[PDB]
Design a protein around this ligand. Sequence first.
Ligand SMILES: [Zn+2]
Lengths: 117, 86, 121, 83, 200, 52, 50
Amino acid sequence: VRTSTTFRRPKTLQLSRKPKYARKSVAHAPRLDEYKIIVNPINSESAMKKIEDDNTLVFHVHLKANKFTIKEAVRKLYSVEPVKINTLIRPNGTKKAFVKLSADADALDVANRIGFL
Amino acid sequence: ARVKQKGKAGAARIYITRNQALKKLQLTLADFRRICILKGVYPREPKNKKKANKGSTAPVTFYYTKDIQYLLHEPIVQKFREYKVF
Amino acid sequence: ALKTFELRKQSQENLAEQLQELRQELASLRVQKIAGGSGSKLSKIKTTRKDIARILTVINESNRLAAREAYKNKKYIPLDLRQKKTRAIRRALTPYEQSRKTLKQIKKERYFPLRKYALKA
Amino acid sequence: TKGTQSFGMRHNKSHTICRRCGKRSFHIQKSTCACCGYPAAKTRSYNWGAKAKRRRTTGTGRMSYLKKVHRSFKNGFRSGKPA
Amino acid sequence: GAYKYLEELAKKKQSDVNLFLSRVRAWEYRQMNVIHRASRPSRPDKARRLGYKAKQGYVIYRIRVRRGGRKRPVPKGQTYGKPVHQGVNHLKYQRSARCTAEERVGRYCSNLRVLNSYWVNQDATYKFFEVILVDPSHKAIRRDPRINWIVNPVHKHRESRGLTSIGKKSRGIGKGHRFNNSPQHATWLRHNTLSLRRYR
Amino acid sequence: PEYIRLQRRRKILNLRLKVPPAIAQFQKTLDKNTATQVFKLLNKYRPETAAE
Amino acid sequence: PSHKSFRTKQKLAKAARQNRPIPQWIRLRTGNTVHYNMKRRHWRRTKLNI
RNA sequence: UUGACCUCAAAUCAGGUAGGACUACGCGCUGAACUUAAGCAUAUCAAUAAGCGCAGGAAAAGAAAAUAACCAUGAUUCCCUCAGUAACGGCGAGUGAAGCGGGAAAAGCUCAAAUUUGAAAUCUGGCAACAUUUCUUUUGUUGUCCGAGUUGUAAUUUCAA
RNA sequence: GGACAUGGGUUAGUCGAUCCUAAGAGAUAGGGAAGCUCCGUAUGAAAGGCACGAUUUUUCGUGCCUAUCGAAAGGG
RNA sequence: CAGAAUUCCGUGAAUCAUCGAAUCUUUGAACGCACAUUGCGCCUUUGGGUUCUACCAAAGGCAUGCCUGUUUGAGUGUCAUU
Ligand SMILES: [Zn+2]
């Protein structure tokens, strides 16, 4: 007994993939980790003034790092909590990140501890 | 970003109704109840049932999406299918 | 200079923590390079980079050998663990099924094979 | 007026860079590369264009894998570890 | 043996029985897709003769091909040149519609080798053919010494290169004076090569 | 669906078209009582199975 | 223009880097056939055409 | 109401495979015009260039629905010869093979059509064992369940019988 | 000096892109075509959802009705 | 050019040769959908943090045709049971 003039195809059981082997012998290591995110800090005169004025570190950062991965990499590499991240792709095709540190920490001591001053 | 669509996270994301769980697991109601009895899986009511259940307030049973996810990889479900084949 | 065999006799966890330490040293050396570093430090940059490659190689060999052992004597194994000579070779008939013969041909060759013979002068 | 005046109004690119051959030959409105035929499956290759064929045929790039196969063949496609 | 009876029935093509079966089946084949799989051969005796076995790895596809000659794809029927090349309508294609059937079925199932094919039905608009296909990747085929030959890569697209039975016919492959000009290119190239030896 | 229509319209052509006698003789089959009697006899003579 | 795409940014960034003079220590190598960059480019004279 | 079978679907179903490139040589398809004819339309260029599809280290062809008219030869391929010949051609320009003979190389065979009927004797796949390796990468054997298969898988026969 | 050499320089939840659709391009279904590809865009397609139930002979029943791309001057 | 060194009672220099283990970014037949948009998605598992219903990250996946099999179906296709 059909009350609709259309015939819709019935639903069938759709088994999920249960492979007999793994297509990859070993899963790849995380290809974008903290050390690959941060390449090296920028130490130009403009970068130094941002350190001493805006409490902002300036880093040469990987292209595929977003503001979230930059924040975690900085927190893991330097144990400092950033309050803001601003990124730009420099005319030479390299990402530069302005990492504004929290008011509790100063960029000067962080810079000396890194050693790039 | 964009204006996130309402109902994409929170209660509407972690709570799943009984009928949607059946569709999610591709189980009959009898099979779903058997799995829920064998495992520890019981209904969990939200604080805001209207928000969890789209906009309706009709009585529906809610299960954690996490619990329904965990039942996806249960070997007992496969044994149910194998018995049906047998 | 890390010696690869000395790496081979260490654990995966020890290799992992040594890799993290080596990465930290490489980061510090690159900091020196941008801040102005000496020739010794710049020469240590390449050695640190090669040590990291050696650590990553040794880890990979252990992971792939473990995969080979796990998938040993199994009908299906991961594609990267299978042979890769050429695509055509993989598609080719195996020597077993190339040498398959019908019962008719087996009887013919069993009873009338090519005899070794010779002619008198 | 054709000539110097008409050249002034030329500020709209008709072709852009191709995603398959990297040449500024991708017709934006046709969505087809005038050089290799992208996004067709096959590469644009004409026997009257002998010179065009050799400008981009095999060996003009890195040839990375085919060099690997050549080295592997000359030793017999062997696998394992040398003693 | 029922195959002798089937063979003789297939010979009696104007019988009332075969006319009725041809009409009903041609209607059904026209309602289905242009290239649709046949669950089983419709002429099992004919399939066995051509090389079909009722086992895994053997596939049969039914196809219909439009009838008539070949019209040049020239725009508006305009040719350019001497009048000897000016005809466009009464032209014909040099391969049989059976060869076209195998080409399209072989392209449809690109993982199968075209074993052979046979006419099954026809009407005014279509000729219906069934193409026998073998799976070179099936172990039942690869372990079979009787059909192993098709697994070798020299047999990739025999239909495309004219290596089938109808393909050899379309090329004029035969023995004797009636088939002298064939293979055309190999024969022509032999007769037009200028052999200039050393001490001449 | 097209396969359903093809099944049913094929049945109709066999009902409409003039069937030759060699094919139409298959539309008159054994009666129910004789068929049951025949199959009762046959099931006593089923061949041996693979396991047996 | 000011409105760019990232692919153009990449193409310009490489082309800007390739438009530089040779390092001097290169010319001191034995067997060196390089004396000046054969591939220099000025923004007025020859365009990138990308 | 349960079932059986046929047909047809679906799945990120289990395991596979196809595409694209190179294309000197190879198999086809499609297909010109310049040019020669002291013009030109048949002809020629040319079963060519361009276009299209498909292979291999060779490909194709190949164990006669083959020649011959002999005292007969004996798969195919290539070479020399037949032979610029027989023939084809506004019988004009032009085009144009084959049998034999000599040599290089040689290798033969497989199915469909048969009642295993005192026994589907055949085969894929899963699973579990053993085993083997250009190879922990390869290739299998045995056991056992599901299946394919009687609308026909094995053995048996191929005209030379 | 828009030259030459060395360096430095472009920071967004709120400005644009991204999202939307326009004219139009365009796969799939299908039909052509020796083919390259052509036509086609809800068409001669089984083109996808949703809710109830002590759990239903512990082998699931019962109802309910359109891709994509395309605007840095349009919409937002 | 700098720089190290390998002692020279070696597991070892080298822009060395050789090469059977690996790596192999974004692509491209190019395969989740796209693409003058580092644009838009979905599935599974895992992890992270002064923040745990949020957010983020990682790993593994999701193209089309076809073949053998598996499972789930459809049909006023053929029938038995009743
Ligand atoms: Zn291109």
